[PDB]
Ligand binder design. Structure first.
Ligand SMILES: Nc1nc2ncccc2[nH]1
Length: 154
């Protein structure tokens, strides 16, 4: 019982784009851009669509970098998050009622204001490693258990 989500990191040689979510799921935290995959839509097409919706940016090729499954205790559905990165975008990041984008130098990624699991897998993304992870959460702040391994094929 899992539901598909996407997550896109615009990762350039010296900086990464994140968005401050203003409401709803994950509000108040910096995040990549993504959301639910639609009926009849490929995961990658969903990732490209959500990047545009949430950041205003157009991406062509997206590179698969990981899969992370999230369990929230007390919630039936697991989140099956397909993570992608890109270094070539078009457009300029757009602030909307839903998200405030902002570039971060790689040594200044705001982990204290991000979901706590990101501290584990972001360093792999930064070194161009691919991964499979699982995180069991209680609430939005507490990781009860996790696994995380590097893979050759996402
Ligand atoms: N970047 C990111 N980390 C997350 N952790 C748990 C749920 C959703 C998440 N999005």
């Amino acid at each position: 019982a899992s539901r598909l989500y996407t997550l896109v990191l615009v990762l350039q040689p010296q900086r990464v784009l994140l968005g401050m979510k203003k409401r709803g799921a994950g509000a108040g935290r910096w995040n990549g851009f993504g959301g639910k995959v639609q009926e009849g839509e490929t995961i990658e097409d969903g990732a490209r669509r959500e990047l545009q919706e949430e950041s205003g940016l157009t991406v062509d090729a997206l590179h698969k970098v990981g899969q992370i499954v999230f369990e929230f205790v007390g919630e039936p559905e697991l989140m099956d998050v397909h993570v992608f990165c890109t270094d070539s975008i078009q457009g300029t990041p757009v602030e909307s009622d839903e998200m405030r984008p902002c570039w971060f130098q790689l040594d200044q990624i705001p982990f204290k204001d991000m979901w706590p699991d990101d501290s584990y897998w972001f360093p792999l993304l930064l070194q161009k490693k691919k991964f499979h992870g699982y995180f069991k959460f209680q609430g939005q702040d507490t990781i009860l258990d996790y696994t995380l391994r590097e893979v050759d094929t996402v």
